[PDB]
Each structure stands twice: as C-alpha cells, then as structure tokens.
Curated annotation (Swiss-Prot), chains A, C, E, G:
Top-level taxonomy: Eukaryota, Metazoa, Cnidaria, Hydrozoa, Hydroidolina
Positions of crosslink type 5-imidazolinone (Ser-Gly): T64-G66
SUPFAM superfamilies given in the database record: GFP-like
Tissues expressing the protein: Photocytes.
Organism: Aequorea victoria
Effect of D154V: In EBFP2.0; shifts the excitation and emission spectra to shorter wavelengths and increases quantum yields compared to BFP
Gene behind the chain: GFP
Keywords assigned: Chromophore, Luminescence, Photoprotein
Phenotype for V223R: In Azurite; shifts the excitation and emission spectra to shorter wavelengths and increases quantum yields compared to BFP
Effect of mutating K161Q: In R10-3; matures to the red-emitting state with excitation and emission maxima at 555 and 585 nm, respectively
Biological processes annotated in GO: bioluminescence; generation of precursor metabolites and energy
Documented applications: Green fluorescent protein has been engineered to produce a vast number of variously colored mutants, fusion proteins, and biosensors. Further generation of mutants led to more stable proteins (at 37 degrees Celsius for example) with brighter fluorescence and longer fluorescence lifetimes.
Outcome, altering T202I: Suppresses the 475 nm excitation peak, leaving only the shorter wavelength peak at 399 nm. In H9; increases fluorescence at 395 nm excitation
Identification of the protein by name: Green fluorescent protein
Length: 231, 231, 231, 231, 231, 231, 231
C-alpha cells in the first residue's frame, strides 16, 4: 500500500504523555528515532514535572509499546498489517492495564504523522492504587520487559484488538503482573488491512544515561512478528 | 404511496431544539443537506442564545441522530426500513438518555417533511445533573466514536425501539457512558409491516468553522445498516 | 424424513381454544379432518360458552391457519418444510395480531400429535380493544380470508418466523387490517428442516350449517406453497 | 387487493352460452372445477336445447378457453398475469373466429366472479356458413390438438390481444383452419401494468360420459405459460 | 467504453418539443446544464406559443425523463448502461403514456449529441382526452414527481424497454395515474451494453422563476440506479 | 494448574438456596450430575420447608443457571472460558432480576468445589412484589424457553458480566418479562485473561417425578456457546 | 473397522503388574469392568506382596492410564483411533516416567484380549530414587490425577507416541511433577489407524474400600478426546 513506503529509513519519534495517577499528576516527554526495517527503537525519556509517582517499568507499555507501526513484519506476510496501513492519517489506541491485587490504568493515544516526525500523544489516568503497594511504594525493580502481543482482528470497529499480560520483577523476589487489553481504531477513513491472528515478539531493554540529572530512562526496543505459516 | 423515493439525491434539512438543563434554557438551530444513497450527511449548528450549557458531543445523539432516515440501506434490505417508509407523514422519537453516575435527558422529536425540507423538531429536558461533573464542567473531548444501534420491532405499540451505549471521551483519559432508550412511532399510517432486527453502524467526524464567532458545531456523519444475511 | 410419512391420507383434527378478550371469556372447540396431499382442510367450529365477543373472521387465523403442517408442498422442494419435520413431537406457535387503530391479540399454541388425532391447543388473550369499534361492535362482514404467508428462517431459536397482513371486509365498505407476526419453535429436540424464504398461498372459505343452533362456523381452507425456483 | 390468491386450490366454474348459427338457436351449460396451481381443469357441458348445430371441437376455443385465468404461470412470471389480476372484477373477451373457406363466429364473453364461483357468460353469433361444409355437415373429428397463444400488450385501449391459428381435424384426412383474434379488457380497475409478450401452451383431452343421453362433452385441459427467460 | 467519457463534467442540454394534443398545438423549448457524475439536472422551460393546453406536471416525463443518459450509475455496475453506451450516435426513445379513465400520449424522441450540446428532439401527439377532465381542465396540482423506472433488456431490437407508473396529485385530493411504457433503440450501429433488470430511483422537483412573464417551469431532477447486488 | 480438566465425564452437583420473598422464608436443595463435554445436565430439586412461594420457572435462572461451568464450549474457544478456568477456587455470582411491572430478586451465589462435588450456595432475597401478580399468584406455566446470554468482559473489576431478558409464559397467553444483570468475580486467582464477547445458548426441559409427594422440580438443560468465528 | 465392535457394552478388565523399585519388589493385581461407550473405568487394586514401597498415586499412570482402548472417541472422529484398531491382537506400550529431582520409572506393557477379558500385563523397573525423598518417603498425598495426553503419530514404527506431564500433590504443600513419554506399537500385523495430533482429556478419582484389610486402592477414571475440528 501507500502507507508502508513512509517507514523506509530512520524516522524521528516524538512522545508526549499527560498522566494523572491517584491525584498525583505528571508529564513525560520523549524523543528519538525508530528503524522500521529492522524493528528497532531508541528513545530517551524525561520527567518534566520533577519526580514520578509510578515506577518507570510500568509506563513502558504506554510509551513505546504504543508505537507499534515500527514492527518488522517479514517478507511473507505484508498483508496482516493494521499498524502501517492506518498511516499517514493515524490510529487511536486505548488500553486497560489491570494490575493484580491493585488498581488499573486507563490510557488513550493518537499515533499519527506530523509532516515527518511520528508523534504519539498519550492521555493516562489511573485509579484504585492502594497506598504502600508495589507501584506507589516503588517496590518494582528497574529491569526490562518482554512478552508476546496476541493480536486478533475486529471487523465491527474496523480495527484490531490485542490482549496480553506482562510480568514485572519485584525487589522482594516476587512477580507483579499486568494484564493488558487494547483496542486500535483508525482515525479515518481510508480502508485498511485487517489481519488474521498473528502476534508480536517484543523485547525492551531499559538503561540510564550517566550524563543526566533529571529522572530519566533510556529505552531500546526490538519488535518482530510471527504466527502465520505462509512461508 | 411509498416514501422511499423521496430520499433520492440531496434533501434539505432543518433541525431545531429547545433545551432545559437544570433551568438553563437554550436553543440550537441546524441546517444542511443529506444524501441517503451513500449515507452521506452534512450540516451545521449554531447556538442562538449565546453559550451552551452541555457539551457538544452530548447533543450529537439528539440532533443529527434522530434523523435516521438518511441511513444507507443495502439493496437486500430496502423493505426493512421503518424510517424512510413512515414518510412524508413522519414519526415521533422519544428517548431517555441515562448518563453514568449523573443525571439524564428526556427528549421528544417529531421528524417530518414540511414542504420539501426534512424538519427535526426536538424538545429536550434534562435534570438531576451534578455540578463539576463531566457534563456541566465541560470535561468531554470534541470527538464522537463509531457505534452500533440494535433496532428491533415493538409490534404491540406500532413502532420500533433501540437500546445502545454511547461512550464519550473525557479530557483526562476516562470514558463517560450514556445509555440510550428510544421509542419510535409514526404519525399516521406507518410502513407496511415492522422490520426484522438489524443494526445501524454510524461514524461521525466532528469539526469547526474558522469563520464563525458563535458557539457552533459542524458535523459529517456516515450511517449504513447490516445484520440481515442473503435471503 | 420420518415426519412427512405421518401425513399421508386423511388425518382427523382437534382444535381447542381458551380465549380471554378484554375481560370477556370464551371457548371454541373444533373438529374435522385434513388432507395433506392436496392441501385441503374441512373443520366445523362451535362456541361452547354461548355467544362470542369477537367476530368469527378474526379468529380464522388463530384456529386453522395454525395447522400449517397440512400444506401442499410441491415435488420440487420437500426440504424447506419446517412444519411437517417438527412432528410427531410438535411445535409451539405464537402470534401477535395487531389491528390497525385498535388493540392486539396475543396467542400461543401447541400443534402436536396425540396418537393419531392432530390436536391444536390455543391460549388467546386480547387487550386494548376500544368499545363500539369494528371488532367489539361486530361491524365485520362474514366473508372469507386469503393472503400469502411470507415465511423466513430463524437460525437462533431453531425455528422459523412468518410475517403477513390480512384484509378484513367491513359492513360500511371499508377495510379492517390485521398485521400478523408469528414465531414457530419445535418442542424438541430432533433436528428439523430450516427453509429458505418461501411463502404459503392460502385461501379460506367460510360458510354455515343450516342444521345447527349454536353459534358456529364451517371452514374450508386451501394451502399451497411457492417462492423457490428449483423446478 | 391482489386477485392472485383467489385461485388457490379448487375453484367452482360455471359456463353459459347463447348461440345463433344461421338462425339456429341453442344454449350450452357447463360446470366443473379448476386447479390454477397445476393448470389442471375439468368440467362437463350439456346442450339444453336438444341437438347442437356446430360440432363440439369448434366450441372448445370459446367455452373453456376464454377462462384463461386457470393458466399455470411459473414463479418467474407471476406478475405478468393479466387474467388473475383482473379479478374479482373480471374482464370482457371479444373474438372473431375466421373459418377457412367458410363463415365466421362473433363471440363476447364476460368472465367474472359471482360470489365464489367463476362465471363465464358467452353470447355467440355466427353467420355466412356453407351448407355441406366441414362445420354444418359435422365432418370434424372429436379431438383437439396442442396449440400456442401469443399474448401481447395493447396499451392504447387498456387491455391485451392474441392471434393464433386453430387446426381442426377433418373426417377424411384434411385440416380445417380457424383464425382467432381476441381482445381482452377489464371491467373496472385492471392489473398494475400490462404484461410483456409471452405464450400460453395448451393441451386438451376430449372424451364422453357413458351415463348421459343428452348431447354433451367432457373436457380436460392443461394450460401453462412460457416465453420469458430468467431475469 | 468510449461513450462514458463524454459525460464527465457539466454538459449543456437543449430540449425541443413539438406537441399536438387533441387539435391544440404547442411548442416547448428548454435549456440548461446537466451533471452526470452526481445525477443532477437543472433545466428551465418556456412555452413559445403562449398558453399551454395540458398541465406542466404531465409533460415532465416527456422532457427531462427522456434524458436518462445523465444517470448516476454506481461504481459496482458500469456495464448495465444502455443510455451512455448509445452515445455519441444517440438513441430513439418512444413512450405510450396512458392515463387512467382518459386518453393517451404518443411520443418519440432522439437524444443525441450535436458537437457538445446534448440535444433532445421530441415529437408528441395526444388524443382521446375528454373535455372538462383533469388534464384538459387543468385540475392537476403543480407538485413534483418521483417513482422508479423498471428497466429490462430486449435482445431483439438491440435496445431496452422500461415500464412504470406515475401518481399525479389532483386539486380535489384524488390521484391521477399515468402508466408509462417506453422503448429505447439506438440510432446505430456500434454495439452497446445490454443491461440485466435494474431500475432508476428518480425524483424531480418543480418550481418557478419570479422574474419571468411567459408560462414557464424550472426543474431539478435527481437520478440514480439500484437493483443489482454486485457490491 | 488449569481447571479445564476437572470437568471430564460426570461431576456430582449440590445446590442450596436460602430465600426471603416478602418475608416468606424457604429453602431449596438440589442434587444431580453434569456432563460438561456435551453440555448435558440433569438434577432434581426439593423444597425442604413445605411449600414454595414463588413459581418454579422463576428459580430456574437462579438454581441451575449460576452453574454455567457445565457449558459445552467448542474446541476453537476452550481458552475463552471464564467459568471452568476459575476452578477449583470458584467464583461469586451476584444478580438483580427485574420483573416487569413487579418487584425484583437479589441473589448472591458462590459456586466452588467442596472436595469432589461442585457446590452452588445461593442466598436469594426478593422484595416489592405485587399481590395477585403473575409471580405470587402462581400464574406462570411450567415450562422454560430457549434463550441466549451475551457474556462480555468487565476488566476494571477482574470479572465478567451479562445482560439478557427471560420471557416467562403466563397461564392466560401473555408473557412475563424478567431482566437479568449478573456480575461474576473469582475467589482468588481467576483465569489467565478475560475472554472475548461470546454468547451462551440454553435449552431446558421442565418435568416432574411421579414418585414424589414433596414440592419438587426435575430439570434437564443443554448449554452450548458460540459467537466467535474461525481464527 | 472390526476392532471397534469389540468394545460395545461392559468389558471386564484384568491388570497384572510385576514391579521392581530400587531393589524392593512388589506386585499389584487389579480387576473390574470398563465402559467404552461413555469412557468410564471402575477398577479395584490389591497389593499381593504386602506393603508397597512407592505411593499409590504414582502407579495410577501405569495401571489404568495404560488401558486407553476404553477412550470415548466422539462421533465426528472415529478414524484417529489407534487404540481400538490394534485389537484383538493388541499393542505394546512403553513409558519413561521421569520425576523432577528424583529417579525414573521404566515400564513396558501388553494390552490385548484373552478371549473376552481385556488383560493388561505390566513389567515395571525403577531406579535412581533417592532415599527419604517424596516417593520413597511416602510424602505424596492420596489425591486423584488429571491432565491431557498429547497424542501424535509416528509413521516409522507404525504406532503413536504421546507426551505429557503430571502434577502430584505433596503433604508439605508443594507439587511433585512427573514427565511422561510413551510409545505404542501394535503386536502385529493388521494395518491400523494412524491419528493426526489429538489428545485425551482424562481424570481419575481415587478412593478406598471400608471393607478391606490389605493395602488397596479403588479407582474411577473418565476418558474422552478432543483436538480435531471436524464437527
């Protein structure tokens, strides 16, 4: 199609989030570039309003797992691609991140082009977080994140829906879980590709920059797909 | 005798409202044109009494969503059409729009022909709202999603009815729910026989006019129907 | 199938109705025989509780248009037959007979074998009839009745649904209409034939017996089908 | 309002004629029944004034051949039916039957319903016949062949017409030709619109009754129509 | 084909009629433009010989319902198009407009290009109109006109034929009907498209010009098609 | 760890209820067995406190309809099963059964395993009923129809919900409506992730036992699920 | 085939095991009947050489999970059946039961008919069991057992191979695992059915007899299959 050709070569990425967790407000700005031929992202995030009430690993699925138009789809599919086909108009991504024995995030986002810079604009709002928990108590370790994103098609809303869960590591040796239920819907109105039950093998590696002072995070993400036996 | 041929090409539309929301009195006037062969619809509203108490996306399901006669039915369902067949006599449409954790609307519209134009005359009343809520606090985004309306027969009163849920977007990321319950009834002689159960599928694009100083709204809406297979 | 073979030759018919119209109760017993090879019925009805509050032509669609297992299906269909295939277990037939500018009947019935006599057992209950109307005022003529019964399939309830309207003649020269919406559902549970959009060309002729004293009616019905172009 | 459903099953028939052939006055009365779902037709004539001047196969095209409403139209042509749709008001059928090398007939029939039975009332007049001819000499065999009737529209008088040739068999081996020219016209309000050109295809079996002493005729006739392909 | 490309963009229209109704002669000249992409016509008519013996709504089907090469055929048919395919050579259109309980029009026309201006040339001749009727008495209202045009193919004359009826409104509250039987035949001899049983959803709106003095009529017509389920 | 294999073959069932209907206190005890590979279910109830205030078909949706873990899911949906996967820990099921023109029920059940048998423990409360109504007057027939239950996800409370309408049959011919609204929630750790929207399809056969003197009920119910196509 | 007909009705079962675990020898004899129409087994086991060195739940997969010719295959497969097709000749079943952090069983068996009694003859030999472990220390609970048996085909040895794991409950609250790798091979030489990747949903329930004195075990097993979407 005409949307896949926009992703050849390195494309800059702008990520803007306006969050509100349990009354505590924050904002996170991110910038960097993204390779779509190899499925590789390099972003750097900064917390513009000082400190951060939630851990950095919990916001990884909101920031950079929302730019899924940078997925390495192989040569033998090229037709089950909702994410690149909704471009340059864009798409609307909403999640419901439900933590076990804890509250829930509610996100919406708009991933679309602004001329050439791919701009992601997230509104986030969380609630029902118990105090002195794992998330509000910062009891999560600063490790990476990796699982599969089981994507299935939805004919009614002319979009897709995905469904996966995430295992976060805790400082006490336990595991904090995170159930993710997402919905994608294009902004409109050019007809797009509707896939057939594939998934996204994804890993993200978190690290820091030894030249910064603000609360920050450096991210390196690898995205590829599988699940269809065309060959 | 059939009213199906009255909606060929482009039909002039006139929309009028009289509102009463916690004693605040207002009026909305809309004009435009409709293309019932594609579902294409385009019209423009102004608020003739200054400001508007409720947000504009709450009145989308009441202003240009009671004129459902501009729905593109496919050729295998042209006889299952309550709305075009009750013309040029018209019908009466009464609702009860139930807002989640808040009050409600009470509408009553009389869609009919007046000469050549298709006139919607709504009288809206809304009580029991909450101060600093999502509605009276103007905390809703200026967009409207893509929805489905399950229309079924209501034989025992010579009319139809429909039940559906409208998901409004909130400024912070959450979702405001509205529960609709409409009851249609023709003025004089309605259709031949009431239709089978089928669903309307709507899309709308909210926008503005840069050359207007009055509190206004420009709407573009696309309605088709499905739900009955090949027979 | 094994249900079609039960209808060869003349089969006796028992019809029992227990009605309740606008507070006034009545009961109608009927008996006779029915030919299924030719599509011909001969029944005689008597009003066991004396007089009758509704006209005899309004009850024709309840009594003998409910025994539709006696339909002459032609040689070239024999597969779109719900009515004979639900035998000897039976089926449950419910209607909603909505008169124009008047009230509505609500019927349910069970058409099933009792050894050899095909027994129909109707419960009827009408309401919202205005006084000094056509029906309660006995302003209907004593003529016959004939139209088509547009039968369509319903996969969900494992049955069919039909939808037709009936034109009754009035003594004042006008026409009293009657919209019929019916649903058939087998008693269970042997799988049956689901048809594909045929209809029933039907006529009934009403006459009287000059040797009776009670309020009675003699009926002669002809049923056949069409609508499918197999050949 | 449609007259198509009045011909379901078995309809009583009554045929009456008043003849005048070279001053010889006679009358033919016929009774029977008709099955318009198969084209099946069966009726019996008697001559109530003693003997018959003309042969019986000359009156087959006038007695049970003006009641063409018992024609089996296939399901793809049920709307192209002038004869069933002009009912229960009826129509007028006027002919001019031209015998080869001989005189002619002048008929005028008014087919309609009288209560429940379908009444044909013919008034025949025939002049200019030849003594010791094929007709008045009774030199025709007692059989009738299989023929075709090309029915076309005649818009400019609100009716149809047909032209065809009837081949009578002669006792010695030759063939007597009869040229027909009929003009139909409904009594009041006819069909919706006049049909396309299509042809009726007739077959008849002439016979006798062994238990009759009056000059009689027993007829069994099968009429179908074709001429319009799949649309 | 090469005929469809001639109708892109606005095309001027010339309409010339030479009529003769019941001895009274008249002439009507019309001019304007016609959009074929949307199916929209805008014409203005003038009566060159002063007054007019027949009402303006009766001549609408002769003037502008004869230019049916300006029909909006959708994207999914483009092959059932006789009207555009007979261009630039043209086609010959003949009707027979039979009024109920009144006389008949007889028209012929030639719709063909003259360089760029699409010129329609109608000869009309009516007869058998009773005096002090609806038509000659000018008892028809000045309303619009709308119905369907059921078009079927005719292989023999290498053209089509359509068949429809028109309901005109009367000042006394009654309805004057008009049966239309038309035939199209190309002028020759390039092979054209023969359709398969579609129809034309058509509406025309009549109005006047407040700056004229002669007997005139301003027309606005919307034409589209349906009836084929390709999709 | 999976609870799907706990429902192979035949599982013992125990049902217990504590009712409170307008102060009338009762208890229902049920025992039987269930076959979750066919949806086959068979069990028998007794009323251990003498008589029963409410009719037996009102308690069918509460007694053996909260044990929905015996639903036959097809092989393409075995992972979309909330009910078998919340085992052997169990779940909590709370309803609000809204009777039309009458009062309501308030149930709360805790389905779980107790050793090897599957124990349903319902605590029912019903108020605001009407004397001489359809419920407390015992005016409902002893049958239960075939229905559908639309189960959807309710992510933000870690559970599911369902909304459906139950049509009860009344002795005189009318229909009593019941509106159900259930909310499921597992005891400890529920399934992996909440299922997609799918519908359960129920059938039930109400009957009696001739060898019982206590107020009892014998039930046989068949539940399958569909609503998700091939993926 | 001719092997499936041998399993209609109840068939007696003889089970003989000769074991040797870590030097300690034992023998277990079992008897009972087995229903193959429903997939149900009822056996009773006794330890002929007194005490038993291994727990009773560890030997369940050797004794009665080896008679897998008593599997309820559904109506829609009947072709993927290796176990019944290898009869009456029989088949040879070998396993390798590898415990986690412990030793391994090595079994071979011959399941074949002796006239009518289905006789299973197991040789077992275990080694590498650490002393004071879970198995030799009798630290296993006396609970049942249930999982799936993933059966795949093996073309080379003209047999099948299955592969599954078993979770045993420990008295200390932990879980003792058991990896099962099995191979089936017919005794010869009649060609058998080779399946395609199905599995066996299986549960076994263990209980005791309160009338015995020797070390014993009463078993109740339910076997059914799934995994193939023929329908």
């Amino acid at each position: 199609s005409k949307g896949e050709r926009l992703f050849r070569g390195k494309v800059p990425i702008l990520v803007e989030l306006k969050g509100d967790v349990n009354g505590h407000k924050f904002s996170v700005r991110g910038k960097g570039k993204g390779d779509a031929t190899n499925g590789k992202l390099t972003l750097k995030f900064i917390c513009t309003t000082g400190k951060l009430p939630v851990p950095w690993p919990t916001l990884v699925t909101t920031l950079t797992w929302g730019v899924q138009c940078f997925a390495r789809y192989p040569k033998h599919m090229k037709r089950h691609d909702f994410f690149k086909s909704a471009m340059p108009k864009g798409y609307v991504q909403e999640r419901t991140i439900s933590f076990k024995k804890d509250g829930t995030y509610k996100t919406r986002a708009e991933v679309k082009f602004e001329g050439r810079t791919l701009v992601n604009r997230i509104k986030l709002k969380g609630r029902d977080f118990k105090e002195k928990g794992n998330i509000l108590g910062h009891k999560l370790r600063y490790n990476g994140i990796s699982d599969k994103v089981y994507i299935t098609a939805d004919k009614r809303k002319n979009g897709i829906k995905a469904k996966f869960k995430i295992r976060h590591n805790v400082k006490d040796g336990s595991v904090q879980l995170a159930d993710h239920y997402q919905q994608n819907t294009p902004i409109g109105r050019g007809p797009v590709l509707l896939p057939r039950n594939h998934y996204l093998s994804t890993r993200s590696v978190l690290s820091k920059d030894p030249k910064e002072k603000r609360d920050h995070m450096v991210l390196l993400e690898f995205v590829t797909a599988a699940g269809i036996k065309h060959g | 005798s059939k009213g199906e041929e009255l909606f060929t090409g482009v039909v002039p539309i006139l929309v009028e409202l009289d509102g009463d929301v916690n004693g605040h009195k207002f009026s909305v006037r809309g004009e435009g044109e409709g293309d019932a062969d594609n579902g294409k619809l385009d019209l423009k509203f102004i608020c003739t009494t200054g400001k508007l108490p409720v947000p504009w996306p709450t009145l989308v399901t009441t202003l240009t969503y009671g004129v459902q006669c501009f729905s593109r039915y496919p050729d295998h369902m042209k006889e299952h059409d309550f709305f075009k067949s009750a013309m040029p006599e018209g019908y009466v449409q009464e609702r009860t729009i139930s807002f989640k954790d808040d009050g409600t609307y009470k509408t009553r519209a009389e869609v009919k022909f007046e000469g050549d134009t298709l006139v919607n005359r709504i009288e809206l009343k809304g009580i029991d709202f909450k101060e600093d809520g999502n509605i009276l606090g103007h905390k809703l985004e200026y967009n409207f999603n893509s929805h489905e309306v399950y229309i079924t027969a209501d034989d025992e009163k010579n009319g139809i009815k429909a039940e559906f849920k409208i998901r409004h977007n909130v400024e912070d990321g959450s979702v405001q729910l509205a529960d609709h319950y409409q009851q249609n009834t023709p003025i004089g002689d309605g259709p031949d026989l009431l239709p089978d159960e089928h669903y309307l599928s709507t899309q709308s694009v909210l926008s503005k006019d840069p050359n207007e100083k009055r509190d206004h709204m420009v709407l573009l809406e696309f309605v088709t129907a499905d739900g009955i297979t090949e027979g």
